[PDB]
RNA sequence: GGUGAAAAGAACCCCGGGAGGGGAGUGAAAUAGAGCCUGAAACCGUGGGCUUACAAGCAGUCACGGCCCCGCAAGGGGUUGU
RNA sequence: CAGUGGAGGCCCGAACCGGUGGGGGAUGCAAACCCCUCGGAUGAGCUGGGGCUAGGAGUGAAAAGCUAACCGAGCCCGGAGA
RNA sequence: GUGCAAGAGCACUCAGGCGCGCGGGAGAACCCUCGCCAAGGAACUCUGCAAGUUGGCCCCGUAACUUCGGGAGAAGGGGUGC
RNA sequence: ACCGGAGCGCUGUCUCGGCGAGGGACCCGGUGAAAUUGAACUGGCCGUGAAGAUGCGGCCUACCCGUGGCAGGACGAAAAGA
RNA sequence: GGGGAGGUUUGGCACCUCGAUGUCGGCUCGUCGCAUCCUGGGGCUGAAGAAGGUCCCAAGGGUUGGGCUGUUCGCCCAUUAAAGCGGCACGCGAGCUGGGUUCAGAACGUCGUGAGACAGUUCGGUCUCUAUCCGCCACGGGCGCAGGAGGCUUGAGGGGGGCUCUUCCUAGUACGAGAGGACCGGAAGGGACGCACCUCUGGUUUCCCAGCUGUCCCUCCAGGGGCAUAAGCUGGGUAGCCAUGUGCGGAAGGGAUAACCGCUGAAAGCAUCUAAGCGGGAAGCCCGCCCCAAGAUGAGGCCUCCCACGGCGUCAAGCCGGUAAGGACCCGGGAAGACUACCCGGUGGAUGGGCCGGGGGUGUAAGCGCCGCGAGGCGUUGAGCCGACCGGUCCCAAUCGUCCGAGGUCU
């Protein structure tokens, strides 16, 4: 009855691995929702991301995403009702895994400080229709 | 609620390092060394880790041993006799053990470290 | 009017329903029946349950290995659940499907000597202005020359922590009888690695 | 020489009670393996030793 | 966590920019307001050429906290500030043109005209 | 301010780093051992006798009782459970 | 008007002289100290050295302040065992 | 000596010179001194006491009033590395 | 650096506190004091009495000694009432 | 117009304390009263209903936050179920404050020729670290428990705890011209409070990682090094600790009752809650929940484990040197902790240091190639380093051993 971690990870039935790769660069598109008096809705929440607090199980992120007047920072949990959630434009060069400082002063200097990683795109294009080769053999 | 994390103490960061690093320094310098019991225990932990890193000889690990100690001389002695002997004795290379009396003149439990190959 | 032993495992948040749940899980453990208690011979109604079997040489003496049914000893003794009487078996979890709130009785983490500030929650004073002298002192006690004394059980500068605590009423989220897990709404006293028992609660009639 | 001030002479008996808790406690001992000496428990007697053979240097 | 004495703006065509908060309107010592909550308020300044003059003690339905309130969906969401909309003593929006995002927590307080006007329900 | 009639004021050995003791030896006396005549009172303490761990008190007094020691007996002493 | 020159119980500010506000200190480091902040900082400035004025007397950009750690009249000494 | 607009300022440090005449552990409250903090910003309080932000230098830029000297560093922003 | 009122920025002054660091406090070895002290075998309650009780009555409570810690009282010590 | 109650007002007396009883307000901790501020039970009504009015009963719980004044008080502000009154050396300075007050300075008015003065006023004004006894919060040691040792325990007797609001539905019906707007029962959400924990939320983490200037040092360069606090500055942060966070507690229900309302029923052919007889009926009362707890000297009960003089006491109680179950010392540490105690591990051993894996943090390092004169950039790469969390490991520290221990009153 040792290995307590193992136990607490055995009750982790939820195996959300069907989510793409995301890092303190950006995320972009979509999430889930509730709204209606009885469930039913899907609202699309994009934006530029922020924090990644990790527990493997609980682990959640938070996204900046800015609106009309001012912005909002939204903390999303990595493991169930978020449905597909799947990102769009990744980018990054997260020169630091802590995007608090943008919550302060950031407007045009948002972009000026948030760089991009073509690298990742190249990777996505690799895994793209090389998965067409798995639609052939191995 | 505290000491839930634990750590042998007294002094301060500056002197924590200073005492660890220098007692380690003067440790490998001579090989077998007398001191106080607690200082002894945590010291031997520290320099033990240092020697497991010494098991390799790659630049990075070496300078990093010099982050703690000093003489590249002492790092030659490190990586030329000692560190290559425990080549197949890994984890735990310190024999610190108690001693009779206590350091009279203040009443304090004694201990002593060894090479341990 | 029911019960079973256990030990503190996790505290997490299982996304049950569509609501997150702070969830204490408790390894209830296969706690075997042994020396029973009747009110004709003892004076009440309880059952003895040893926790986890780890006992050989280092046990020694009597054993309710004697009893009539053995099992040697756990590794950390046995306890008595009042109002209890099974049916001649060993027990772990199955006796509780979800939907059955239960009180959870466990030891509590220890805070050694507790300052009155972090015990009965006091002010201490001002963060300047007056004197830095008191600042975090329990203020004053009773009146002058009458009372003439201090109050027996007055909230004071003393100990807090190493205590027995019974918590009350928590939804048993689910039961894992394939192993030994009993997951309920998160709370539970003590460290993530200390003994804790389960007992059926009192609500309706 | 301030606020708290002993109001009366404490009794020699009282003295001897507060003292009744002191008592210069005795230590304990064990005999040295393969020699005749008394070292403290779990120690390495100066001249004597454990199973290894270290120190031994008393003239 | 809007507590008595807190400055905050409000997003309306109403013509009132920044109000202070008097007595959170709940428990007889509640003193802590979040989304959906209602504060008594004291207008410290506003848009002149109109109504809701500077000084008016007003009712206010809070729509934005800077310390994200929890969510049963596991998640949580905040804004960049602290804000409300000026409601009257009948409890109702004295504006007609709200500005920016507010929280669906408001629907758990069910003030639909505040929702139907919100151009970013979260 | 007082060792002793007298310096005879302690050679030798012993433990001991010395400090100081412990046999010897000095004298009537070392209970005169060196700021030592005669050393009282508080004052700290070594051992012995009596009693004390369900009890509320100016600390004693009256009586009963037990426990310990002289007394031929019968009586006396010290202590303290009520 | 432009340069120049470089006036000042001028300004910011070390040394140095002050001693505001909070804090510590309170049988103290200490019979006034220390810690953070402080006002002046070429002047009616600060100071070394040698000299002078004193007890109803001095000195005083003045408080009854200082005159040797207690000054509405020092200090010791005497009358004086008021 | 280097560095900072300059400086007997400040940081490190030359030469020189100490480690402060109890130390060893533990790592409780309350204390001393010190740092950081959500959302709120004087709601604290006799009082913004206290601490805080602001801070160097260059440039841009400055109101009522006035004895025309001042007010002025008024106030409000920009820059600073290599 | 003098005494009111206001505002702006800023902030553990506050809501309302949470954590951390060191130096004490705690244990071990060496050194080791003060004011105070009628004697102590020193409990609450309700009464009493030179009107404010451990001690006097009445009742109830209380196994014998400490250590860390808290200041109601012992009309607490200090100052032969300013 | 009368008679009382209480001892918080203004006061009469001058008994304790002048070889000293620190006189106002604020703070923190409270508590006791009930003449009740709110909540709960209700009678009377000029009580239709809602709301109110007064009087009974009843402390269990609760009794907010700001402006102005040193202020107690009091007016206002927004709230409130409600913002009670009173005592306790006008509670509380060997707990804080030191705003008020009456030290020495100075002033305005003011009286006084005056020195000075004023139940006038303005400004400034040193509040002492060591708890000896009772007391009070916690932690042990001594003996006890009329065999000995380990584990499990009954609850004698305590301590905590108790609260309250809002809409929805019954139903726009009962009441009522209308406006208004219900009782009876049920559904749901909130505030303050207590309780335990860290998963999420968020703060802390004193060396876990990254960045940065001056400087001196190795060793020239990259690379690192210490001072810049008791981390030199910043950007981050796991465990642990934490409220802002999380889950719960009050309850439900049982028993006699308070005020009050009912039945039968005489005394007294009638009537009457009463005299014997019943029933209903409070947030109160005893509970039921939470916790301490056999030093409950009354020292309880349950379960197992243990050998009979061993050599003295010859009778009647014991004495003594070693054993049996056990227990101890020391050790290894600890979500246990001032110390002590408490717990677990002690070579038959995963307790701790180290090593290896997971998780976590930081976020691509030292070096090497390539372009750029270069600052650096590009690759090397989600790399390096790894504090606590999770485990696997005898690698090294828990060796060896010592000591205590029933030898089983009596009727």
Swiss-Prot record, chain A:
Residue stretches of biased makeup (Basic and acidic residues): 121-138
Which organism does this sequence originate in?
Thermus thermophilus (strain ATCC BAA-163 / DSM 7039 / HB27)
The entry's family comment says: Belongs to the bacterial ribosomal protein bL19 family.
Protein's recorded name: Large ribosomal subunit protein bL19
Is Manganese there in the keyword field? no
Q: Which GO terms describe its cellular component?
A: cytosolic large ribosomal subunit
- Does the keyword Acyltransferase feature in the UniProt annotation? no
UniProt xrefs under InterPro entries: Ribosomal_bL19, Ribosomal_bL19_CS, Ribosomal_bL19_sf, Translation_prot_SH3-like_sf
From Swiss-Prot, chain B:
Keywords in UniProt for this one?
Ribonucleoprotein, Ribosomal protein
Using the record for this protein, list the coiled-coil segments as residue ranges, or answer none. none
Listed GO MF terms:
structural constituent of ribosome
What is a single cellular component term in the Gene Ontology annotation?
cytosolic large ribosomal subunit
Q: Which cysteines are disulphide-bonded?
A: none
Q: Name one Pfam family in it.
A: Ribosomal_L17
Supply one GO BP term. Answer: translation
Q: Belongs to which family?
A: Belongs to the bacterial ribosomal protein bL17 family.
Oligomeric state and interaction partners are given as: Part of the 50S ribosomal subunit. Contacts protein L32.
The cross-references to HAMAP family, in alphabetical order and at most eight, read: Ribosomal_bL17 (MF_01368)
State the protein's name: Large ribosomal subunit protein bL17
Please report the organism this UniProt entry assigns to the protein: Thermus thermophilus (strain ATCC BAA-163 / DSM 7039 / HB27)
UniProt gene name: rplQ
From Swiss-Prot, chain D:
Gene Ontology cellular-component terms for this entry are: large ribosomal subunit
Pfam families xref list: Ribosomal_L32p
Q: List UniProt keywords, sorted A-Z.
A: Ribonucleoprotein, Ribosomal protein
Spans annotated as Disordered: 1-27
Q: Which domain of life is it from?
A: Bacteria
Q: Which GO terms describe its molecular function?
A: structural constituent of ribosome
Stated family: Belongs to the bacterial ribosomal protein bL32 family.
Q: What is the recorded function of this protein according to its Swiss-Prot or TrEMBL entry?
A: Found on the solvent side of the large subunit.
Q: Which HAMAP family match?
A: Ribosomal_bL32
Name recorded for this polypeptide: Large ribosomal subunit protein bL32
From Swiss-Prot, chain E:
**What GO terms are given for molecular function?**
large ribosomal subunit rRNA binding; structural constituent of ribosome
What biological-process GO terms show up in the record? Answer: translation
InterPro entries given for it?
Answer: Ribosomal_uL14 (IPR000218), Ribosomal_uL14_bac-type (IPR005745), Ribosomal_uL14_CS (IPR019972), Ribosomal_uL14_sf (IPR036853)
Q: Looking at the Swiss-Prot or TrEMBL record, what is one Pfam family this protein matches?
A: Ribosomal_L14
Where does the source fall among the domains of life? Bacteria
Record-given protein name: Large ribosomal subunit protein uL14
| Originating organism | Thermus thermophilus (strain ATCC BAA-163 / DSM 7039 / HB27)
SMART domains on file: Ribosomal_L14 (SM01374)
Q: Which UniProt keywords apply?
A: Ribonucleoprotein, Ribosomal protein, RNA-binding, rRNA-binding
What functional role does this protein have? Binds to 23S rRNA. Forms part of two intersubunit bridges in the 70S ribosome.
UniProt record similarity statement: Belongs to the universal ribosomal protein uL14 family.
